[PDB]
């Protein structure tokens, strides 16, 4: 969903 839950993965 958002930069936040998306932390350091892709």
């Amino acid at each position, epitope marked *: 969903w*958002n*930069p*936040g*839950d998306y*932390g*350091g*993965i892709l």
Partner: single-chain antibody
């Protein structure tokens, strides 16, 4: 000791607002970011949101404008303010600490789940009941095959997680035992947590992902949830044992 105490009243009335308060005896709030997860009475695990390391509240597409996270970093308190309360929200509400503290690169995800605060958001109802013969319900969407199974001590059994939208490689397998919070078993499809030997093998790419339970001991009788982190952020269906008599 690091103790995550998520606070809740037992019974609350629909329409108003519930402030779920995680008082953390151990860490300062900007270091190991708190993730919030509801498990309702006969339904399954929904991820609600995460307030991250600097200060960003990321949320679920269904539970979006209901949820307001404030946080007091001097008193050690994360406040999830849930506005406009609905009759089906009876559940055990969890707050979960991160494995990485501040640094993002190659994200390891989650370690300390708090005890689960049981809050009935329902003025006369809850989920399932009666009088002796009365209690039973469990219906969730994300296809894990087989979820209902019949394996004994020694028997090898493979759980195939097919995702509703495509995942690439980004899946954490969470083992919930009877009376327990969901434990992190294998992160990023195939990378094991520091502690567990090479025995539960999570293997796959794109949409279909295979957890082989190889040497089945009494601790292996558990509910194995797929946390997909690519499109949405959802925990899927898991695993249960059907009792014939």
């Amino acid at each position: 000791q690091v103790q995550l105490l998520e606070s809740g009243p037992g019974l609350v009335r629909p329409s108003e607002t519930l402030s779920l308060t995680c008082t953390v005896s151990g860490f300062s709030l900007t270091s190991f970011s708190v993730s919030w997860v509801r498990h309702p009475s006969g339904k399954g695990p929904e991820w609600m949101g995460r307030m991250w390391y600097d200060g960003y509240t990321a949320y679920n597409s269904a539970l979006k404008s209901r949820l307001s996270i404030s946080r007091d970093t001097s008193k050690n308190q994360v406040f999830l303010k849930m506005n406009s309360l609905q009759t089906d929200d009876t559940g055990t509400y969890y707050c979960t600490r991160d494995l990485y503290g501040g640094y993002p690169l190659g994200f390891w995800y989650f370690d300390f789940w708090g005890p689960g605060t049981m809050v009935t958001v329902s003025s006369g109802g809850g989920g399932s009941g009666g009088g002796g013969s009365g209690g039973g319900g469990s219906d969730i969407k994300l296809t894990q095959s087989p979820s209902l199974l019949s394996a004994s001590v020694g028997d090898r059994v493979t759980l195939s997680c097919k995702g509703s939208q495509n995942i690439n490689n980004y899946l954490a397998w969470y083992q919930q035992k009877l009376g327990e919070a969901p434990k992190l078993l294998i992160y990023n499809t195939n990378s094991l947590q520091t502690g567990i030997p090479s025995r539960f093998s999570g293997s796959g790419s794109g949409t279909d992902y295979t957890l082989t339970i190889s040497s089945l001991q009494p601790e292996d009788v558990a509910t194995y949830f797929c946390y997909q982190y690519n499109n949405g952020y959802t925990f899927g269906a898991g695993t249960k044992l059907e009792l014939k008599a």
